[PDB]
Design a protein around this ligand. Structure first.
Ligand SMILES: Nc1nc2c(ncn2[C@@H]2O[C@H](COP(=O)(O)OP(=O)(O)OP(=O)(O)O)[C@@H](O)[C@H]2O)c(=O)[nH]1
Ligand SMILES: [Cl-]
Ligand SMILES: [Cl-]
Ligand SMILES: [Cl-]
Ligand SMILES: [Cl-]
Ligand SMILES: [Cl-]
Ligand SMILES: [Cl-]
Ligand SMILES: [Mg+2]
Ligand SMILES: [Mg+2]
Lengths: 123, 208, 1017
């Protein structure tokens, strides 16, 4: 799985979207467990998310200190952010993601963990 | 290791939506009728290595049928789709099956009843028996709720590889790039993110 | 690029280039494959492409190219064959026949090009459907004899005959007119003596050939239709049941042939045909036992290994056994020399029923239902099957699947969780299992209890403990409720409850507690009769449910509330009375600690709890004590409500608190939930809130409009506005819920309706489209349905406020505003049914939009819209007819009769609304019968158009002939005239009328349809 050298800092169920600006609409990329994984050798923290049943990767990127979580006009339980190097589908790509959770509490927990992981990565 | 899969069924039953869900994760809500055929490669990781389906997603509307049974040549498996909210699409399943097996006489075939997420169901479980004498696998599926959405490919893979214990496994996850561009230095960042923020996410009443 | 050259028909076709395009499409990938696809489709679609087929078939080196050439001819043959001059048809016939013979006589081509030869055979069969036998009387004699000169040609002729039989008997009903289907069936029937002669000879002189298999494949098709004497008066049954079962390469097709034989309903007075039906079964089962596997074989393991064709064989064996035995097992039940055969066959089915494969298990379960239903009714039969039924009890009890009520499930990581989705397929499988197990319990109640009771002991004593084992056992125990005596049930259920309770006290961890709790809840909810008669148990059960409502597992809490509802719908009486040994009725105890009990429940589970209390409360029929019980129940929401209204009106800006909006929505939802179960009895509680609720509706409506104006349409997506609109929706839902169940309709009209319409109608009409709630239309539908006849002016006001503005939302496309679409036509349906006078009071321009809206509904593929649109048109035609010979009705027909006829014809004939065929035909029949019954009092035509005095009958046929001539120019005048003559004669006979329409739909898909086809009836 290439996860055996990592510690699960945080896990939450979520639905991930990517923005398609050609169509100016959000498109689902996956639903499943969003995991914050800290590599035990480098202490680098990444988001890794796999789809239910197929276990296919829909998010794989470092939680960069440069990223910023922003609200979406329609939701009190989601965050959108620009990511510049996600390798879920092969070569590194940039996306505008949105990630939605089961509750506002989960979304607030995710944001606090996201920022904790950003501090870890700055070292 | 790749296998040709033809996907057939009446127009609007959900063939392209089902394929797009598997390709990209998305749920396409609009109905854009397929013109002839669209071919999409589709890879699954298994405990027996990767399996690749070349998915021939064919047109169900007669006036868009293109080459019709010409698409079936050299197929190694197939999915016949119908819509459990539309009885006419089930009544046409014998017709699609007839055309298919006249070209592909000995292939594994899954019969799929789509849209089982809709509450007002018209083709009830007990009505669905066409697969019995024809040796097809049957699944209730929903591309919308993803109920059983992996099962047609898992069953076909087990038949094509010849291993009933085959399972999907978690794809490898390489360490992602650590040095990345700051998106906020990209100038169009402010415009691009505002558009994303002020476009509402779909289905805000869903549980996720 | 170079590939496009094949589309230029002003040059000779570059055959090598076609083959490369084809190769790129089939063997290539990416952009090149996709470009080649578009080029091939355009080439195939060129109306002159068939002139190239001869050339492609002779000179191409690509079998796929030749397949496509045949597809091109196939389109020509099935569609425009009759325009070709006869020399061209004879010519095409000759080189298709010649190519087939040539390919079969080349051994290497016959072996390697099966796809292409099969396609050519099908193409020939299409020619036969056009030409045979009237222009080809010698085909069957020519086929039969050409078979003797070559093994390959003989085999391929079996393929041609198989396909011909398929096209004429199995797939004709949709694809041919009734008359042509009958013509081709009679033609094949006339010639079948010779065909069977050839088939039987091949079968006698062979063992395992590809020629044998092909011949048996053709026989499988014949068995659908041929006379019985060919099966029972030749040697063919012995050959099928012995010789062809021995060899594996003929076994699968022979089993399928024997399944088809097994379904014919024999002449049941004939003792010799009966002996032959017994014998072929004896032979087949003997072949299975000695050549394939003995009756003791572990078919579960065999199927799971999935070697070779084992799975298909075991599927086909189940189909054979169930088909034969459902039809013929009585032939085996009285003769004692047949007992072992009867029981071995059923023992094979027992083994098949252990296979882990849901669809196969359902196939055998269908048979078991057939068997046990018969043993339940038919004297002196059940003892024959005692050992089979005892084994079956075990199989079903050990393989029960999860009932709908059980909300906790084991996920893929091994955790017990609330179910994500309902599973209609397993819910149905559970109900099928319950049906069989109910019967089996009646057949031997002692065996059933013994099995279940000893299985339970091995769960308590741990020797067989597991989630799967306690689950399947508990589900089986619940499923047989109603099968036992109340006295055996008493001891049985008492035993199961106490044992399951002890299970729950013992097992540690959230997961084992949630599993055993769900099993306790399933069992108790299934046995209301026992709980009714035993208050001490009912009380502990209910109190135990209240304990489960405090568990951390949401699946357990949800299930406790649903089980509460389920028990109380049946046992409510024992909550409303005072029990001996109890200080007060239990309903009053429940109401008192309602805050304590529900404290850990989520809002929607709290609402279910209140709905349950509403069920109990409505058991009380003394009006005074019930209104007091209602008042007692609603204390906490009424107290929250009273607070909210005094603060909300003291400063209208307290509603921007999003937490206040949530509290308001839950108060209304609590009222909806209680009103759902109490119905008309809810009226006192609605009276306490009604006027302040409608004021809140207004205040919320103003905030929504102000938010949209200040922030734009995107405001409707915000959590704030969605929360405000939920207050409006829940308020409409409460009123709709009450009015749907109300009995005092005078109070509805005199107290409720006027403030309702003042509060909702103008707000709907004067909001922008994206702010309009489709629930307004839904609420108005119930108002019109229940009291529309008492408020004719209100119905007119409803129409004026919603009709044109909602129509304008939904008449640019078929997709926008899906809820409004559906509710819109539901409302128009009930107004047109119950208050048709309101449409008479429309100005003519608005009535015209009404007709437009109805025909617009025809054209939807969405069934909820389409079905209501066709019903409205039918009801409107009936409404107009009931008015008689008056100006409004005469003007309706002159303005709109032919619009309805032509719009109905358009959706009938355009091949995109086939789901509505029956209602379309019904509507069209009604319109035509109006004219032939002379119910239209004025001329449908203008002064000059035809001679004065001309009947509407003559003019209708002339309008329709002209309409059809221009819309289907490829029909001859006679086709159109014969079709219309049949259609008008048959307008009192729906099934015949529909057949004539289906025949028309066949004929418009081709050229040269026979006009005499319409004389079929
Ligand atoms: N509710 C529901 N809708 C679905 C589901 N699957 C598909 N749909 C919808 O139904 C329509 C199906 O469209 P397509 O997938 O394009 O249909 P198709 O079968 O590919 O049609 P052709 O390409 O014409 O043959 C789309 O509007 C989908 O959004 C489902 O599981 N549930
Ligand atoms: Cl169902
Ligand atoms: Cl071919
Ligand atoms: Cl005979
Ligand atoms: Cl009762
Ligand atoms: Cl119109
Ligand atoms: Cl004519
Ligand atoms: Mg499609
Ligand atoms: Mg790196």
């Amino acid at each position: 799985t290439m996860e055996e050298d990592e510690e699960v800092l945080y896990k939450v169920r979520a639905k991930l979207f990517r923005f398609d600006a050609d169509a100016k609409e959000w498109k689902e990329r996956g639903t499943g467990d969003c995991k914050f994984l800290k590599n035990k050798k480098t202490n680098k923290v990444r988001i890794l998310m796999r789809r239910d049943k197929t276990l296919k990767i829909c998010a794989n990127h470092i939680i960069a200190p440069e990223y910023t979580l922003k609200p979406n006009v329609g939701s009190d339980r989601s965050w959108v952010y620009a990511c510049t190097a996600d390798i879920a589908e092969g070569e590194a790509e940039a996306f505008t993601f949105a990630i939605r959770f089961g509750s506002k509490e989960n979304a607030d927990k995710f944001k606090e963990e996201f920022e904790k992981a950003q501090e870890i990565n700055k070292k | 290791v790749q296998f040709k899969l033809v996907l057939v069924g009446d127009g609007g039953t959900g063939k392209t939506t089902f394929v797009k869900r598997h390709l990209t994760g998305e749920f396409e809500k609009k109905y854009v009728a397929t013109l002839g055929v669209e071919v999409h490669p589709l890879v699954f990781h298994t405990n027996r290595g990767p399996i690749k389906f070349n998915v021939w997603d064919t047109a169900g509307q007669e006036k868009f049928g293109g080459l019709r049974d010409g698409y079936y040549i050299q197929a190694q498996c197939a999915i016949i789709m119908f819509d459990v909210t539309s009885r006419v699409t089930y009544k046409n399943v014998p017709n699609w099956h007839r055309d298919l097996v006249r070209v592909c006489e000995n292939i594994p075939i899954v019969l799929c009843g789509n849209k089982v997420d809709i509450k007002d169901r018209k083709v009830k479980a007990k009505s669905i028996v066409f697969h019995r004498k024809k040796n097809l696998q049957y699944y209730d599926i929903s591309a919308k709720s993803n109920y059983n959405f992996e099962k047609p490919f898992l069953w076909l893979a087990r038949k094509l590889i010849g291993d009933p214990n085959l399972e999907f496994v978690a794809m490898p996850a390489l360490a992602p790039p650590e040095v990345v561009d700051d998106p906020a230095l990209a100038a169009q960042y402010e415009h691009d993110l505002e558009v994303a923020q002020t476009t509402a996410l779909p289905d805000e009443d869903d549980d996720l | 690029g170079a590939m496009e050259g094949i589309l230029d028909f002003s040059n000779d076709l570059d055959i090598a280039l076609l083959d490369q395009v084809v190769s790129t499409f089939y063997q290539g990938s990416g952009v090149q494959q996709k470009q080649a696809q578009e080029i091939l489709t355009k080439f195939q679609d060129n109306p002159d492409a068939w002139q190239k087929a001869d050339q492609i078939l002779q000179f191409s080196t690509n079998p796929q190219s030749k397949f496509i050439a045949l597809s091109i001819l196939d389109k020509l043959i099935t569609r425009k064959w009759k325009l070709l001059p006869n020399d061209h048809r004879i010519g095409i016939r000759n080189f298709v026949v010649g190519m087939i013979i040539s390919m079969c006589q080349d051994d290497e081509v016959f072996k390697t090009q099966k796809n292409l030869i099969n396609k050519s055979d099908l193409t020939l069969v299409q020619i036969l459907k056009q030409e045979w036998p009237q222009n080809w009387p010698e085909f069957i004699p020519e086929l039969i004899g050409s078979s003797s000169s070559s093994v390959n040609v003989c085999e391929n002729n079996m393929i041609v005959l198989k396909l011909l039989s398929e096209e004429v008997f199995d797939f004709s009903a949709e694809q041919m007119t009734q008359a042509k289907a009958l013509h081709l069936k009679n033609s094949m029937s006339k010639e079948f003596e010779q065909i069977f002669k050839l088939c039987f000879q091949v079968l006698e002189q062979g063992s395992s050939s590809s020629l044998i298999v092909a011949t048996l494949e053709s026989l499988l098709r014949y068995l659908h239709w041929i006379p019985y004497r060919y099966i029972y008066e030749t040697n063919i049954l012995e050959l099928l049941s012995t010789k062809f079962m021995t060899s594996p390469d003929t076994r699968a097709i022979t089993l399928k042939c024997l399944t088809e034989v097994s379904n014919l309903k024999i002449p049941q007075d004939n003792d010799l045909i009966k002996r032959q039906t017994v014998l072929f079964f004896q032979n087949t089962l003997q072949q299975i036992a000695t050549s394939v596997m003995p009756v003791t074989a572990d078919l579960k393991a065999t199927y799971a290994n999935a070697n070779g064709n084992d799975q298909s064989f075991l599927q086909d064996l189940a189909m054979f056994l169930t088909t034969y035995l459902a039809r013929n097992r009585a032939l085996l039940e009285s003769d004692e020399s047949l007992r072992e055969l009867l029981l071995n066959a059923h023992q094979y089915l027992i083994q098949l029923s252990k296979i882990e494969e849901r669809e196969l298990f359902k196939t055998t379960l269908d048979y078991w239902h057939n068997l046990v239903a018969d043993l339940f009714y038919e004297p002196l039969k059940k003892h024959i099957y005692e050992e089979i039924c005892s084994q079956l009890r075990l199989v079903i009890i050990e393989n029960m699947v999860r009932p709908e009520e059980v909300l906790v499930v084991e996920n893929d990581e091994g955790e017990i969780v609330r179910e994500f989705v309902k599973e209609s397929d397993t819910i149905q499988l559970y109900k099928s299992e319950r049906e069989v197990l109910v019967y089996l319990t009646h057949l031997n109640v002692i065996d059933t209890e013994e099995i279940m009771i000893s299985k339970l002991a091995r769960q308590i004593d741990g020797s067989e403990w597991s989630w799967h084992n306690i689950n399947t056992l508990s589900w089986a125990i619940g499923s047989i409720s109603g099968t036992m005596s109340e006295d055996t049930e008493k001891r049985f259920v008492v035993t199961v409850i106490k044992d399951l309770l002890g299970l729950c006290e013992q097992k540690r961890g959230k997961d084992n507690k949630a599993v055993v709790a769900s099993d306790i809840m399933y069992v108790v909810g299934q046995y209301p009769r026992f709980l009714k008669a035993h208050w001490n148990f009912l009380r502990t059960v209910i109190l135990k449910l209240f304990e489960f409502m405090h568990e951390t597992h949401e699946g357990v809490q949800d299930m406790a509330c649903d089980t509460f509802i389920k028990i109380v719908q049946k046992c409510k009486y024992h909550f409303v009375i005072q029990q001996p040994r109890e200080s007060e009725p239990f309903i009053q105890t429940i109401i008192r600690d309602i805050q304590k009990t529900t404290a850990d429940l989520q809002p929607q589970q709290v609402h279910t709890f209140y709905k349950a209390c509403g069920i109990i409360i409505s058991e009380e029929r003394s009006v005074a004590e019930r209104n007091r019980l209602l008042s007692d129940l609603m204390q906490l929401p009424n107290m929250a409500w009273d607070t909210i209204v005094e603060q909300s009106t003291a400063n209208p800006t307290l509603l921007l608190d999003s937490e206040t909006v949530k509290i308001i929505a839950n108060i209304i939802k609590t009222n909806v939930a209680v009103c759902t179960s109490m119905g008309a009895d809810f009226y006192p509680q609605l009276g306490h809130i009604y006027y302040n609720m409608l004021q809140l509706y207004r205040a919320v409506s103003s905030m929504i409009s102000a938010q949209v104006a200040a922030e734009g349409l995107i405001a409707t997506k915000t959590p704030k506005v969605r929360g405000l609109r939920t207050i409006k929706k829940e308020i409409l839902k409460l009123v709709e819920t009450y009015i749907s169940k109300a009995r005092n309709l005078d109070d509805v009209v005199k107290v409720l309706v006027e403030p309702l319409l003042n509060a909702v109608l103008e707000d709907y009409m004067n909001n922008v489209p994206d702010a309009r709630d489709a629930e307004v239309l839904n609420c108005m539908t119930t108002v019109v349905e229940k009291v529309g006849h008492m408020i004719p002016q209100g119905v007119i006001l409803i129409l004026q406020s919603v009709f044109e503005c909602t129509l304008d939302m939904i008449n640019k496309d078929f997709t926008e505003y899906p809820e409004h679409r559906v509710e819109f036509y539901k409302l128009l349906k009930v107004i047109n049914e119950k208050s048709f006078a309101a449409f008479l009071e429309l100005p003519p321009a608005a009535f015209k939009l009404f007709v437009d809206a109805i025909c617009w509904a025809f054209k939807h593929n969405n069934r909820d819209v389409e079905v209501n649109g066709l019903q409205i048109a039918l009801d409107l035609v009936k409404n107009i007819e009931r008015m008689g010979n008056v100006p409004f009705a005469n003007e309706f027909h002159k303005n709109y009769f032919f619009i309805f006829v032509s719009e109905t014809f358009f959706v009938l004939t355009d091949s995109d609304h086939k789901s509505g065929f029956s209602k379309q035909a019904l509507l069209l029949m009604k319109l035509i019968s109006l004219v032939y019954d002379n119910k239209i009092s004025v001329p449908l035509y203008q002064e000059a158009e035809v001679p004065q005095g001309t009947s509407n009958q003559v003019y209708l046929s002339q309008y329709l002939a002209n309409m059809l001539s221009n819309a289907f120019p490829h029909l001859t005048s006679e086709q159109i005239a014969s079709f219309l003559s049949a259609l008008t004669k048959q307008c009192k006979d729906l099934v015949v009328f529909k057949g004539t329409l289906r025949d028309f739909l066949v004929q418009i898909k081709e050229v040269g349809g026979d006009p005499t086809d319409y004389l079929f009836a």
